[PDB]
Nucleic acid binder design. Structure first.
Lengths: 128, 234, 54
RNA sequence: CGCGGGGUGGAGCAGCCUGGUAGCUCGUCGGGCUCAUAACCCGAAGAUCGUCGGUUCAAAUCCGGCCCCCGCAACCA
RNA sequence: GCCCGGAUAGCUCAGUCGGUAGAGCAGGGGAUUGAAAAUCCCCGUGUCCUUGGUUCGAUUCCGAGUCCGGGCAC
RNA sequence: UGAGCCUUGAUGUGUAGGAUAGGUGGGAGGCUUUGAAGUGUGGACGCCAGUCUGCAUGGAGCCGACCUUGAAAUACCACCCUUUAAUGUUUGAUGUUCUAACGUUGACCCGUAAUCCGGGUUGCGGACAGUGUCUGGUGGGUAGUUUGACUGGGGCGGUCUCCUCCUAAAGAGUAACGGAGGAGCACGAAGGUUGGCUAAUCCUGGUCGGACAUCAGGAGGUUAGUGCAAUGGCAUAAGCCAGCUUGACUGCGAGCGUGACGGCGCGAGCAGGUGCGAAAGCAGGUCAUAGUGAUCCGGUGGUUCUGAAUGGAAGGGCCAUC
């Protein structure tokens, strides 16, 4: 007779609020949830969400990474979020939009992107 | 085992249920420990330590107690009249076809064996061995089923009980009533302990006690330290 | 040692301890031998059995 | 001297272990695209397995002889 | 000659506590591009090795033997 | 913090079923300060609303027992598989912290006029390094040795055993890196026995193999066959086919060919039991000669034969065999 409801085995840790980091780049976007005190609570990515090819660097693929990730942290009973945004890729703002539409409350959309003060020499790519 | 109910925690501590004791004094205690208001029945679980793999393989049969079991081994006679009259007379529950054939098909039954001549089995067969808390079928796996109704019933009333290799490697058999003397139960228990040794297991050399434990209907059980020829051999 | 055809033991089917030794092609037909032969211990002809097995 | 390996469609290679079985990449020819050639695409053709014999029902294959190509060896005082 | 441990889609593995035949890649068709490299799609196949056995039914759960792979033997 | 052993507590969501189907015996019910139940509040909780249930409250029944469905039926006590928390318990694994063994080729003192060595204080390190026994790896640093004969010199090459033909000289078959070929197994019928039958090849006719299937006729007369090499052999077939079968027997064995010996070959007949055949008779492997391995050592099974004081037993012997 029985045909199932519960999505996973019973919740673990349980921290109520967390930080997310979206590393968006030209080839792929990675969304990683953490604790305030620095601990990965789970991740998912565009490439791991089954896109590959040119689809891997698209706002639509970025969204579907975020919703997949949102499932992985349900085991932690999280409700509130802050989000760090990181890099020049597409999906950069579109990933956030998927997190608020996941039912999460987002505290700050802090773009962090790491900028040399002139610093180390870039590669010279696309050459003539 | 015995329930979490508020008095039932109290009962299990005061009576000293489960854990080991010696055969004469365990049986004399077992009458004192009783949880039922009336005559409880006593059964033995006997562990043979080799083929728990196979339900057929370790020893099966029947054995003679000097005290024929009272309530347990409550024996009936299956036939419409095939040489009936002595087997019906002897003290058996019931002699017939129709009531026992309907009962056993519908499902549950409380009684031991209804003993058949060949023609009786033919009209209404038996089904299965998954008999759970309910044990109710004769079979060649019990092996005492050959072949006449007055013989097997009257021998039960004199002393006969059946014995069987259950899938744990465990042999479960009724030993008697707590109406019996501590002595009477112990003689019936000792007859069973020789019976498992007597037919000999296939890959094992005697009674081969891993554990023996004797339990009474609601009282509880007492695990048994010895092979029952007095208290201690040497 | 020899061939790929191999040695078997043909054991008497009387309970006496006696055997003949013989080689048999296991690969081509492994259908085990019956065959009747003399047993000197019962001093009569008896069926032999098996092929170096339990 | 001698010993061992080799002789395949126009080219280079595979299959060679008591065996019946012809495969790959090039090149070739026909059609196509292109102003036209190149390339690119599709289709097809091409070896009676060095040569002679023997064993075998059957041999490129195993066996023997000869020619041809390669590797090693042809010393010791 | 032992103890081990494996024998399935073509392959490796595996949903396979007995109630119930799959993931990854392999060949065909469709869907697009300087055919292709490369997306996405729908089929890919097994009496789970041959035989015993528990059972309400079980390949696997308990067992005997063939072949592969790993030890100690001699 | 692993694991074992073990003390108590526990889940098993199939198909049908109200739900509850870990295997299985007992068993007609269990009533301290009740046993209520029941609605309510939380927890565990997973083949999802399905179990157990702290406890507020309530002192006013779970529920089988033929109450029903189903192979198994449930309440309720045993039994014990899985998973398994609580915890007990021994031991391991790990870290950190300690100092008292132990190191100190740290310092300072003293013996001392040595300042090596010992003793003292003190600092630092510390159950680690160290060293002994055990043990796996590695190890030409070192050592003791080994590394064929034949051979038209010897090295290279070939070859070493067993069968058949020639050389071989019309009994024995006898050399040479003389000439030429093979074997290192197969076979439960390819053995036994009764019964029957007869070959390569070519021609002629022949529905597509018209170069060669199957067929029929004729000639031929074995030119074939022979498990595999050659020599011998064979029509009464030792060839080919059919039926029943396990003499591919156990004990011996006169007589003998043969070899330096080891050993190898051969066999009438006798005793036991048997197969085939009406019987005589036949049969102790294959039509013969290739298809192999001395001894020690060790293995498995059998055997009163023995088994270091008596009785048993490891062990040894004999027999079978690896």
């Amino acid at each position: 007779a029985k045909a199932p409801i519960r999505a996973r085995k019973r919740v673990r840790k349980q921290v109520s609020d967390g930080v997310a980091h979206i590393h968006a780049s030209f080839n792929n976007t990675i969304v990683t949830i953490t604790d305030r005190q620095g601990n990965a609570l789970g991740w998912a990515t565009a490439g791991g969400s089954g896109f590959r090819g040119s689809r891997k660097s698209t706002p639509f693929a970025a969204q579907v990474a975020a919703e997949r990730c949102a499932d992985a942290v349900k085991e932690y009973g999280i409700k509130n979020l802050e989000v760090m945004v990181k890099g020049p890729g597409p999906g950069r703002e579109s990933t956030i939009r998927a997190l608020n539409a996941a039912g999460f409350r987002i505290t700050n959309i802090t773009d962090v992107t790491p900028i040399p003060h002139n610093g180390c020499r870039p590669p010279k790519k696309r050459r003539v | 085992m015995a329930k979490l109910t508020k008095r039932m925690r109290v009962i299990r501590e005061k009576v000293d249920a489960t854990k080991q004791y010696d055969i004469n004094e365990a049986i004399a205690l077992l009458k004192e420990l009783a949880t039922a208001k009336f005559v409880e029945s006593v059964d033995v679980a006997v562990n043979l330590g080799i083929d728990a793999r196979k339900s057929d393989q370790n020893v099966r049969g029947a054995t003679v107690l000097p005290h024929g079991t009272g309530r347990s081994v409550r024996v009936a006679v299956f036939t419409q009249g095939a040489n009936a009259e002595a087997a019906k007379a002897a003290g058996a529950e019931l002699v017939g076809m129709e009531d026992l054939a309907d009962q056993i098909k519908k499902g549950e039954m409380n009684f031991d064996v209804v003993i058949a001549s060949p023609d009786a089995m033919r009209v209404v067969g038996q089904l299965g061995q998954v008999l759970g808390p309910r044990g109710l079928m004769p079979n060649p796996k019990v092996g005492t089923v050959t072949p006449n109704v007055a013989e097997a019933v009257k021998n039960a009333k004199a002393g006969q009980v059946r014995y069987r290799n259950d899938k744990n490697g465990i042999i479960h058999t009724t030993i008697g009533k707590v109406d019996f003397d501590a002595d009477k139960l112990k003689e019936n228990l000792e007859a069973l302990l020789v019976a498992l040794k007597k037919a000999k297991p296939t890959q094992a050399k005697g009674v081969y006690i891993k554990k023996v434990s004797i339990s009474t209907t609601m009282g509880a059980g007492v695990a048994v330290d010895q092979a029952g020829l007095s208290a201690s051999v040497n | 040692a020899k061939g790929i055809r191999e040695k078997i033991k043909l054991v008497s089917s009387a309970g006496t301890g006696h055997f003949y030794t013989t080689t048999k092609n296991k690969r081509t037909k492994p259908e085990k031998l019956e065959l009747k032969k003399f047993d000197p211990v019962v001093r009569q002809h008896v069926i032999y059995k098996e092929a170096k097995i339990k």
